[PDB]
């Protein structure tokens, strides 16, 4: 696999510089990984109890075509708490089998399948870049 660095927005520096009130309600918090995709939380999140330097690969795991938040059910907070909130997920490399030149009906059936994935709400598929974007309500 060919993956680059994890990142977050606002940055860990920005969040470390917030006061307690601000860090309890971080808007548009996004965790991504170069050449994989990103997870953007759709409601404000409380990061006061999250270690920003033990987040990538521990709480949020981004692998090719796969995003995971809280892989260990025993340590997963209740729905609506921590990062267990609705999120917009964008995944690169989501092409039809055959790759970027597959168009027409074969591409349409691929989009149909992505629109139907259980527990997701389809947002978009970009046929030129291979990005599938969709929302989930909990992890």
Swiss-Prot record:
Renumbered to this chain, region (Nucleoporin RNA-binding motif (NRM)) spans: 5-138
The subcellular location is: Nucleus, Nuclear pore complex; Nucleus membrane
According to the entry, every stretch annotated as the Peptidase S59 domain falls at: 4-139
How this chain sits in the membrane, per its record, is: Peripheral membrane protein
What is the protein name for this chain? Nucleoporin NUP145N
Section of the entire sequence shown: 858 to 993 of 1793
């Amino acid at each position: 696999p060919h993956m680059g660095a994890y990142w977050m927005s606002p940055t860990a520096d920005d969040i470390r510089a917030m006061n307690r009130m601000q860090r309890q309600r971080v808007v548009g918090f996004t965790v991504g990984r170069e050449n994989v995709g990103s997870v953007q939380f759709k409601v404000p999140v409380d990061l006061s109890n999250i270690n920003l330097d033990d987040l990538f690969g521990t709480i949020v795991i981004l692998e090719p075509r796969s995003a995971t938040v809280y892989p260990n059910a025993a340590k997963k907070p209740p729905m609506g708490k921590g990062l267990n909130v609705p999120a917009l997920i964008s995944l690169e490399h989501s092409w039809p089998r055959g790759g970027p030149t597959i168009k027409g009906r074969r591409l349409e059936r691929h989009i149909e399948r992505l629109k139907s994935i259980p527990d997701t709400t389809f947002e978009s598929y970009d046929p030129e870049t291979g990005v599938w974007a969709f929302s989930v309500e909990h992890f």
